[PDB]
Design a protein around this ligand. Sequence first.
Ligand SMILES: Nc1ncnc2c1ncn2[C@@H]1O[C@H](COP(=O)(O)O)[C@@H](O)[C@H]1O
Ligand SMILES: Nc1ncnc2c1ncn2[C@@H]1O[C@H](COP(=O)(O)O)[C@@H](O)[C@H]1O
Lengths: 285, 285
Amino acid sequence: AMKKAVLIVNPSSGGEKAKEFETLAEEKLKQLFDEVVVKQTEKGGDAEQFAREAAESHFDSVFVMGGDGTVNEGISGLAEQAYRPKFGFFPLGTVNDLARALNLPMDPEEAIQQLDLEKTSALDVGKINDDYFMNVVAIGTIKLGKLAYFISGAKHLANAQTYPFHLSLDQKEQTIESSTVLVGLTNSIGGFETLLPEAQVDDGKLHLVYLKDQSLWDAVKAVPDLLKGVDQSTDNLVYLTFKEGTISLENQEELTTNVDGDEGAALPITLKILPKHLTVYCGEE
Amino acid sequence: AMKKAVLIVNPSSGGEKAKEFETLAEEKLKQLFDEVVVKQTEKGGDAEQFAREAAESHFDSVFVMGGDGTVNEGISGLAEQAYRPKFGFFPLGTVNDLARALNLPMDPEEAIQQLDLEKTSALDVGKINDDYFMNVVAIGTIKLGKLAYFISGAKHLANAQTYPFHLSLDQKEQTIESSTVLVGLTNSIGGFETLLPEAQVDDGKLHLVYLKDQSLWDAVKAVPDLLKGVDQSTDNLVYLTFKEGTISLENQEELTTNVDGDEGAALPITLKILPKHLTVYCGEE
Ligand SMILES: Nc1ncnc2c1ncn2[C@@H]1O[C@H](COP(=O)(O)O)[C@@H](O)[C@H]1O
Ligand SMILES: Nc1ncnc2c1ncn2[C@@H]1O[C@H](COP(=O)(O)O)[C@@H](O)[C@H]1O
């Protein structure tokens, strides 16, 4: 009947004129929708709750104005609902990986301006145990000028323990020893747009990378591979894709994942792709 | 006649109980010296001025309580003075490269406790044009967890322009193309104690390292070399020692150096070793 949209705003996202961006977005949506409900997040979980309530109320569309944290929550609130509103977002964050993957303008005002209800794309969603992810599941990752970044960073690989991971992926079984495992959905992770160049938002796959490091010396050698973009296995890392899989430890230890930048489920974890799960408003590319 | 010492204190160095460290140092020095003058720095240059005035007054010893900035200034105030007081210091800084090189205790209280006027070492001092350095002259250097350090750092090599440097070292001439040149006095630079493992505080040499990078890809490949400690030239970097030399640009551009963590002289620069220039109180190693 009446086309309705909710606009979920994280006021802590963005900078000084973020409030002005909210006004632009609201007046733009009011041109497109008969009714626009504006909801402001106050704490963790709010965006997820708002998005879910919008789905239960059969709203036409759900829009998020915030960073990746708020976008994840919003998508989490929609995921596997019997009816799912179309999803849109206006990036206010410092990174905005999903925006990059969908070729949205980095500039919020431009993103609002170029919103086209006709311009959509299917969007895979990740599932990890009982939760959802939209960008990445990371395992085991947490005077000299430009050189200091290595002496701090290339070192901090040493601080990274190796684990006996077992990977059960699409009914293929293997045990590895590694300090670092990443599972991504799109080409962009942490603002590095070329990390997974072959990954597409609707290719229906999870993309896994792990380092073949045992020493601090093999981990360091993987760094140029990551910079070039991971599209194949090398001497220093392995690249795999899968639809469904379980990652566990062969010597069970309390190991917690990092999911879209936040502490997530502990191992073991079962990861699944939800292919073409959402309809998202995208760029004109 | 009467043994006199000055204690130069940077109150902005160190943390909460730094004031208490000053008291311990003062009462320790009063056991060792008939007179102790305590001077507190307020701005850049003060430590250098205090140290120089102590030399002109023929004080027996000069002590610095602070970080590398204050130690550099103190040493700069003594350098090439006709009479030079013996030099000591109590590390309060976050890095303290010189302390590491002399095997002083990291802990200030322990450093004060173990001060032995009989335990000394000769100390080379560096000269760059009209100024002095004690650690390093650097040229051209200024969600994913531990991986982000590279994606930030391994990238930031790209932001590093290459320059056509000319090196005139001990009457040997060569032109190189590089983004990064480092000239050090000791084994420790920026808190990385194994960077120049063969350098000794009194070996009478300046130690030069430059990256053989033209691309972002050769610079990255130099990183494991640096981590292992530079004791030889490799496919990715060159290691040289010299006593006197001039570094210039073949296409003159405004390029400023970084000297012991602070902006220093612009190219061209003439670097010289002042071998065994100071007597410094050292560790029991
Ligand atoms: N009103 C608010 N004030 C402060 N922080 C908030 C607010 N609403 C959400 N957050 C937090 O902001 C983070 C998400 O921000 P972002 O990653 O920019 O979307 C989460 O940790 C939320 O708990
Ligand atoms: N009283 C003071 N208050 C604030 N900063 C100071 C003071 N005295 C010296 N400094 C600065 O502290 C720096 C040196 O600190 P450090 O590297 O810890 O020895 C230099 O930039 C000085 O200008």
